[PDB]
Design a protein around this ligand. Sequence first.
Ligand SMILES: [Cl-]
Ligand SMILES: [Cl-]
Length: 162
Amino acid sequence: MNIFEMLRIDEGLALAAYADAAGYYTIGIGHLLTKSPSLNAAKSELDKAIGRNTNGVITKDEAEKLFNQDVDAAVRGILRNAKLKPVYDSLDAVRRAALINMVFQMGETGVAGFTNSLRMLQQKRWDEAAVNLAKSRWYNQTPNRAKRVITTFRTGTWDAYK
Ligand SMILES: [Cl-]
Ligand SMILES: [Cl-]
């Protein structure tokens, strides 16, 4: 297994836009239409990313293209961050996928907010990080996903996804 299959399991696939638990418009495989509060700004944004004047619905191909774009953006956002990069550099391949998964869901700035947890990961304090990440707004709003991602950081295995 790799990061793309792990995220496909966590993001799912939808060909028309939908609102998440916080009300953010998403489409495809976890693709955020926009950060803006404005709803009108969301469709405009999508069309620019899709590269066509959409009518609301996209194709599986456009979704997978967006997915490739977004997984790449997540990884780069980690490396461009002073708080995330060092953590990433210290982790094994499986756990790096877990970190990317979080950034893909919450964005670089949002993940950089897990100060104590990040530092425990960098120190290889698996169980400590696991208990602390479970005590968060992220876990409360998306507990099934948080649990799987946390199980991954805890064990260093893909068991929560197979
Ligand atoms: Cl879905
Ligand atoms: Cl969930």
